[model samples]
Target chain A: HMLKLIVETKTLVQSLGFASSVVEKRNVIPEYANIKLSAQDGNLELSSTNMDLYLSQKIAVQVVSEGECTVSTKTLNDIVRKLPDSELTLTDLGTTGLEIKGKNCKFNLFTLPVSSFPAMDSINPEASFKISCTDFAKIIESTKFSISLDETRYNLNGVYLHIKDKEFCSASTDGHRLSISWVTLEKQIKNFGVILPQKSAEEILKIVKDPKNINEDIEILLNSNKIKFICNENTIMLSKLIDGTFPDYSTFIPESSSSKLVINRKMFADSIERIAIITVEKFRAVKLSLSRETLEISAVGEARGNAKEVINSSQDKESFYEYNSDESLAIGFNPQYLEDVLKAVKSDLVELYFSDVSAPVLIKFPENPKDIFVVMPVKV
Target chain B: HMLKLIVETKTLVQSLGFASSVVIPEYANIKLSAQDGNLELSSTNMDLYLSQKIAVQVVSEGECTVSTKTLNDIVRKLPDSELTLTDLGTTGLEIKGKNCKFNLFTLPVSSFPAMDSINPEASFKISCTDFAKIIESTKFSISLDETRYNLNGVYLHIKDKEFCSASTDGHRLSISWVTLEKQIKNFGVILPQKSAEEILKIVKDPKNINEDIEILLNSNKIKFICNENTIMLSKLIDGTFPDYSTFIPESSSSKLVINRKMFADSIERIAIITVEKFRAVKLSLSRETLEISAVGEARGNAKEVINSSQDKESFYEYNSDESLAIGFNPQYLEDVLKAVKSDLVELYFSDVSAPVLIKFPENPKDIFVVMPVKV
Candidate 1:
């Protein structure tokens, strides 16, 4: 059998890059770490998988004959990336090898029989629906950082997507801090919940990162064992869903608070960053002293030094009596957690609700209704 | 005792950056002394020494030596201008800038070593730009081998108005020259690699760059005086620099004149195909065309050809029968071409084993010498 195809270096490199991300860098089986290329009917399809995650991409190709082969993903990527901007030919040399020819230059790459490559199981969706790429990406971004890294907590290792009555919610927690965000769906779906593994979530995000694709709709097909994200006309990603149940996060959400302070998000983040510099690595807690209209942030390390910054707060005028009955409240929190929670709040004004120093503080944007972040305070 | 000074953050950070470069991060003693109207900052890493004097309007007089690590970080991130620094006696430093006050912890002032006083035997005048260019171009080829510590730095010798600089690392050699505006006494000095690097950083600034830089040389010390604000002195490399004059080709029979950029670009593309460990590329020189090729063990070969420019007819008068093929470390040839300022470069090769001399077609001041590799 013979195979020949012509394509632009840029297009080929991009497709190979996406396909290569799914292949394990070092695998026990050689074919498992290689990218399989199939050329047929004026199309070139690239596929790579590492058992759990599989990525496939198809691009327009000038095909002369139909055949297939597998090659090292790294070697192919490097050669195509380095080749100058021009049309290049990839020809299968039967048993000899594969030849890639460019302007005045050619590279002969070793290849393996395509038969050795593992086939990805086709997905039979139990439910299918359309979601805006923008909304989906926002959910991942707001909660992905809180995914549990502890291997024992396998259930919390991915973002939990729960949909009910045309409302979608995604939540992640590492037992220390939890982030939950929601987006209103346009239509009702067959209420379902799925725990998407961390890698699968990231790969899905990467597919829609391009601005042109962000506004488009991504077709998500979900089954008991697999979830496939068809991002564009040329790309599709299939990932095995985590076979565990996500924790019920409703109890973690604070319903009421003794005191609420509306403060500028930028200044709060900056003050925490400065105070954190003087904090020792082991205990990075910063003390927060809140009074009528003032918030004092301070931290001290035995060896390094101490830093203190005072930022004025603008109380929500409607709830002026929230903190009026309380004597100045004092709490300690990991400055990094507070900074990250505040960073996710895009609004100019952020609200911090403190029930007591012992309980977790709920952080939210005064104007945003779909996002909530909570951090368990560290006892000073 | 109390001391206070008002200074721009940018100005203070610049001086601190230069002093910080000479100090080892772990054990570094940076001495800061305040007189009536100035602050002196200095640091030394055994033999490599740097000093910078900032003309600050001192409100009080005192001196202190502190570890450079913490102070550098605080100063770098501090807001830009009009920073007030006050010494809190034994308690440490109080830095107030733009609504932020940092009570920095400081080390004892008495724990630092005294600065060295350098005495030079000879002094020469050279343009700051010229001096900086020569060092920057030659430093890349300096020997990285610790065994050959002497070859780890560029060699500078002034033979009248022409100042010759050269560096080699066994594999390839780079030689460059610049003309001094004024003729000086014949002298040569081999600066240690560390010292040569520091001097380049000091003179790179474009503010005080147009002025003349005074170079003072001694048997063991070299001092570069850019202005009153900056004076860097370094110890010279003890061993003698290799006699690079013998490496320069006296004459050549094979000559090829080609467009400098085109030739460099072709080689750059071909070099990517070779294994990164030993980047060797072969050049097949025929009557009018040059072919470049490289091959790796598992990877196949890559070849590209570049035709000689029409202007080659003029150079054919000297050596028309010279058709030669040679192998070379593409990186060395790329460096030599990058150093040449002319649009077209003339290459001189006697044989496959002989050293190749790459020179600018018009400018004769800068010359690059590369020892060819055997395939």
Candidate 2:
């Protein structure tokens, strides 16, 4: 019964996106439109799912008798919503049904057997590791962007977690791009990783919020089969991970490149930004021409206008030319990718290296080379 | 020539818009598009748009240039676009016409003459006392929704010296409704608030800016009426203001029945946040039970619910009660009519207070109101 209520509550309210489809007027099938409730461990869990996203909430309740029941979601929600923060009684009155009597108002709702309510597959909490919630949240934020919702490449569809060098690393890739970040371990964590399902990553993000700024480290336990996250007050468990392998991205980055630049980062970034205005979404290509002392830049679209600017150049032919201009050097690149990396770069001098006109170029700050980005060159 | 250029620029642009017609590609135009020569200016006074009028520069060597005109149109007209022109090369040619020997790099007769060149309109001084600032205390936050285009451009129109700036996104309308001491003595100005915003950021230094702004308008061209030192601009969209005379409310402040403070407070307090979904705010009002509250629909599971506070005659005698629409945005309405601080705020209704003419009896001169929305 406690497990049922916990599950129902978690499925009904307090979940970020549960109450999204309800219309103001729902007089059609009043019977199938009610809140389901079940009591377990002397607590009640009320839940409702619109199929797409589910809203679940857990609250302490009194179970005079162990039973399963359902009531009109409208009447139930309305009566409970007005209460100003005080515990009330949910009394069972046999056939006539139930009474939720609070301070000033009392709501009598018809109840149905909770036996027919939908249930989810339950899994065991076998595989695990205890990791800090701070690290968990940071890792999720940094890599969640790379998770692909596209079902074709199922393996890279979720954030991947694994232990390496005694630290927990979470990574995700959406075929076109990928992000991987790691954090130190509190203790020796077992080396294991899994591609967390998209729904689970979202659900975890919703409930893992701590108000008092407490670093509630979560115990992450995973096996070759299941994944589980355990907290002091809550437990989130997922069923399975996609059984495919993620493609290796290491081959894209060059061991060395033709040109390496060190210039005032904002100046070049702003110039590129101005040029990007002339480009459109699909073919947002900007031509980058670099030579001995100047770099001619231009971006034009057939429909939209054109923008061109000359940024101060920092390059030499072979005097250890910090920027060694390669043959076929006037390459085109998607300005949006450049804009994204530009936002992430944090220094006055950014090191941009390109191998050829068609190959992906790597962009990184001189201070932070450990994390480098490679973007596919666009055809102008 | 200056006046002709200004008028031609405005009329040609407006005519072009009305004709949304096609044009040839950029970098393709006839030859000899422009010719310029040095001129000596005798300044009677000194408020130059630039530093000097005669600083010993290349006096003159009238040069005719060829360039495409389509590229210039896009630079000057595309919405939210910035122009950056580059000097490619000199025209190389030897015409040897008249008694002059000339060396010119003749342009391909393909490139368009860049509109990126900065042009400044003449300035005029206006009284700062009658100038209205962009911001006004209102009932709603400015709508950031891009779908509402008409609402995006705040209406800044003036009759003589009296100016009004208004905006609405269907749900609510806020007229930064205020009155300056005097009517604008100069020609009326209607500058796009957007162009004005950009000018504020790049044009005049705030510290040295004059409070007595210059208000100028090229009747047939673009308007450049500005504040002391700040310049606001935009090519006026060719359109006329709605005939608000017939739309204005007929009943006075004495007609409507609503306690302003109570109604506003009640709605704001019980307002259920719905920015994620409908972005609408609901208001439930009754006779003696004239309670105000807002509610949002749940995601799934039909939850038919309605809650209201108690009323004397059971809030409009129930069934006979008037169920009016709940405007999506309440804050904007609350703002425009803010001065009505009295508990009993009056709302004059004409077929449902839409195009609502709302005002307080205390200050009837300043009418604050908005159009209602479908619930």
Candidate 3:
């Protein structure tokens, strides 16, 4: 059977956007790795899955004839991307191919039988909740950068998200640094926690950031096996949750510190940037010497060069205070860790708490009081 | 024994701009000398030498040759305002900013070898801005192949009032020209690409465009002098440049004027599909339309059609009896179109295998010539 219908170029490409990533460049079976487009009852459905993850979306279209077919991802996206902005007609020929015609352009794309396309298993979840798109995107941005890349520690390779009381928390760590961010919700969500793999977190952010219905809340359905994030009334992203248990990151955060250093966030970042120029090694070390009045940042490369910068502290507040002793304390840290924490800080003043030279340092902002960044010291 | 000077950080950096390439950490040393109430920055390599003078109030004057890396580092990181630099006896240099001080080790001045100044046989006057524009437009097409040493620089020549700069890498060629306000004795010289780049920067400097520069040329050396503030001297390229004038066709069988941007845009769009190592697109040019098609080696094939109206033609006045179909390297065509400054570009072609001549319909001072790929 030959089926034909007219649809806008932008509408078709945007509808098929989610399934674009399903087709791997080096695929074994032809039909299983292709995106299946099925049209029926005045609507088009695009579906793609890599077994564990499935993404699908539907858009309204003029149904000239009802049919189904499968085509390679590159062929579909390339034809639509190059076509001029106008209504295009796509006709599917039984056992022949798919013909796409638009203004001054025609494309004949090879297709495989729709019967061989693999179907994604249905996800049945135990719990579901509604969260704002803004909230979902914020949590993803704050913690995704710290996700561990080590293959052995599979549990820390994603963001650990859960609810405790009325606050929703998201935390990620890589054994060297931990980022924890949370916000208070109006309604309490109980007995809900899932470790979303880094790939799924990125896909969810992409959907949530869509300006079409960004203000709307997304329905999140979860279970031990899978999690589905649904938005825009038709788009759904279902992903397999990481099966390992995330380390208890609370123990990594120091409760109390023997020293506290408070400084302007911008000033502190600039000084560290200047000192970083002298660093020659990959994991370069920057030493911070704190006194009652000033903080000096320095880095030394024995053969290359050395740099030292002094920042005067606030007079009235006494920016640096030692609870244990009054001796001038010197500690070393990776400048990259400090930079990462400072990038997300919105407040003017950032506070750093140190237990000892060997203990992990906690970086926080006193205003919002919800986000915490802990970085381990480097023994230089 | 000591060198002390007071100058703005920005002024000093800009004055000593060209000398940055002299001290490559493995090559000759860089020297900063102060005398006659001014500071002079000079550097020398085997083939090139650059010197710049700045109006600085020298407190105590002396000369020293230090490691260029450390000096550049100090200048780049120093605060933006006035900076004071002093020689710490003979061992190191001390630089002071608003509230910061940095000390760097230095090498002895006597360790640096003396460089002999190059004197050119002929000097000509030219507008600074026009020369800069000519060099800037043609320098991109210079050959990067070290083996083709003759093609490593843009050929500069003077034909009456027009100054011409041409560069080619055997596959394609680009030539640009500018009209000068006053004409002098004619000269033709091939300046190395590096010297052209340095001269372009100095003349294109925000304050130097409207000014004049004296271009001195000889059989072996070339020098550019703007004022007391700047001087650039370099050894001329020795190899004979290819006689490219013979490659240009005197007249074309087919001449078509099209919208410059539209043609360039269509070429770029098809470049994505022609992903082969040698990107080639078959252009089917009919009387009323041009169809661009490319077969991307097993990936697939793509075709796009553009009508005569895309060229802003009022009617079928320029249509020829025979339609021309040609295969070309899309990259060369794009470069030729980009170098054109007019909205309408006139393209001349003799046949599918002949060279293509591209020219700006409005600006007659410049011309671009590209060879066709035999597909």
Candidate 4:
């Protein structure tokens, strides 16, 4: 079979990079780990899959061919990425070897039979919708820190997307701390919920991260078993959806509190950060001693030293108040979760609602509507 | 015992960082002392030693030792205020800042192993900038294989009555020379790799590279008096370095001039497909252009042509009328290019099996050689 094509290395290099990510460095089926390049009419389509993810990207090919070949995804990506910005060519096919050409050089990688790698079957989505990349990113970012890493608890291993209070919402929890955020939609869809597997969620994040693809409306198509993201004209993803049910988070999300403590987000984060330096993972909890109008953060390292930062004044005019009782209490929390929650909160001031110690305290941004973080206290 | 001092947080943190590099985890202490109305910090790892002094207000005179890591970690997190450091002689080192106070456990100053002063047989001085350049260009070639103890560090000696440094790992060699104003007779030292790295770091300091530094040498030790208050002494490798003068190829039957960047770029591209164990790229030379190529076991192959004789900008005199093809480890040639900063370089070749010599045009002081490989 004779096959040939000419293409620019710039975009070709990037698309192959995306393809390489999906092709599991898997050699069990050597061909399964390879990128399948199909050169047809006007586009050079490169596809790779680890069964969980099947990614395809097509860039404009200068000249056309009508054959396909499969080669190691990582090897091809490395070679093409290093090629200087210039037009390149794939010459006529030969035995098991291959041929390619550049202006100053000619090189090729060994190819496998295209048929050896299974092809992706076409799928039809039952429903389709669009969301701004910014809104999607907010949900992903805030909840990214809480996704459970437990292997047996697969349900909590992903960020959950669902509809609540007529607004699009997403939530994640690792049993210790939970984060939830929402964005209003132009139109609401009934019974829309999908758990994005942690691994696949990162893939979509990278898709959105491409600088050339601006923050535009992303086309998302929902299928029974698969969720497809159409990032732009050149990039598309059909990732396997997590097959477990997400938690009914509202059961623990605090509805009311007896005392409200408002603190500057940056200063709160900084205080926790400094105190946390005195802690190691084995002993990583810090106590938040609160009063009617003051807060103190402190922690003790393992036999080395102790640190504390007392904040007498917060920028808020009414920073702290006891709505029910004037009694003060100190609660212990894994400073890791507090740092993540504070950093993810977009507002200048963060509100902490404490009902009682060990009763999961809810963290909220005063200006944000559906942004809530239910952080569980630890017994230190 | 009592000790106290007030100093700027910035320089104290830095001097302690330098002192920390010499101390190992087994003995993670940096000795702190009050002397000459200054705060002196020093650390010794049994093999190498480092010391630095900072200006400070001395309330009392004392000395103690504390974990270099612990002290560095605490001060690194403290606020940027003039710090009051007090040696709680029996307790610990108390560091006080605006809103925080930290006490690091300290050992008795007598427990810290102190390094002896180097009574040098001879000493010489040179520009720090020139010294830094020579060490950097030649050190990378030092053998990493621990079994070759003699080649594990750069060889600093007098070649042709001028100070020179050369290092090799059996596969390739790099040599560079800088004239010493007054040479010490029969004086040479093989600086262990660790010591050479520390010396390079000292000379490359942004503020001190322009300043002249003094070197005090003994039979088995070398001291770099970096400045008035900074001194670094290190143990030299005891083994004798092979006489490298006879190992370099002095004559070649063929020679070619090529652009350094273009050659580097081509080799890098081929390196992607070349086998990792043997990154060999073959050079086929002619009177007009040079052909470079590499064939891989499973990574496919590549061939590149660079026009050398037809061009006027870089096409210098071609030595022979006939063509020759030779193979060398692409990494070795790339190292020569990296060390020799000249835009244009000349490659001297004898035959397919003979070693190739790479040199800069106007700079004869820096010489590099890559022994040919069998393709």
Backbone collisions counted per model: 0, 53, 0, 0
What's the C-alpha lDDT at position A22 in model 3? 51
Largest TM-score belongs to which candidate? 4
Instruction: Please give the lDDT score at residue A90 for candidate 3.
Output: 80
Docking class of 2: incorrect
lDDT of 4 by residue, A1-380 (tens): 55678988887787877886677874565446687777887888888887677787887796555778877777778777877757778754566455667877877778888788877766687767778877777777778889999979988988887776567888899999889888887775655778878877777777776776657767878766778887766677777778888878879888788777777777778778877776766889988888865677777776455666667754454433232347787889999899899998667778888888878888888888768899999876
Docking class of 3: incorrect
Question: Which DockQ value does candidate 2 get?
Answer: 0.05
**lDDT sort, best first:** 4, 1, 3, 2
Choose the strongest candidate by DockQ.
4
C-alpha lDDT of all candidate models, in order: 0.77, 0.47, 0.75, 0.78
lDDT of 4 by residue, B1-375 (tens): 577888888878777767766664436788888877998888877668887778899888888877787777777776666888888755567877765556666777777767777889878888887788789889889999988999999998875557888999998888888887675766778988888887788777765788877888877998888755678888888888897866577677888787777788888887777887777898878876778899888678878877754454445345678988888888888888887667788888887887888888888888888898887
Against the hidden reference, what TM-scores do the models get? 0.90, 0.52, 0.84, 0.92
Clashing pairs in 3: none
Q: Evaluate candidate 2 by giving its C-alpha RMSD to the native, one decimal.
A: 12.3
- Candidate 3 per-residue lDDT over residues B1-375, each given as its tens digit: 489988889987766455675444534456888898888887777666777788787988888766566667667766657888888764366666664555665666667755456666667777787787688678878898999998999998778877789898887777888776666577777888888777788788876788988888777888888744677777878878888787689789987777777777667666555655758877777777778776555344556677777425322123577888888889888877876566778778889988888787666766777787654
What TM-score would chain A of each candidate receive against the reference chain A? 0.90, 0.67, 0.86, 0.88
Segments in model 1 whose C-alpha atoms lie over 4 Å from true places: A16-33, A50-52, A82-86, A93-97, A116-118, A301-303, A313-326, B24-26, B55-57, B181-187, B311-323, B340-342
lDDT of 1 by residue, B269-371 (tens): 7776577766789888866678888776655566776665466422212245566778899988888788756677878888899988878877666667788
Across all candidates, what is each one's fraction of true contacts kept?
0.35, 0.00, 0.13, 0.60
Model 1 sits at an interface RMSD, in angstroms, of 2.7
lDDT of 2 by residue, B101-151 (tens): 122223443243322222434333443332333323221323446654334
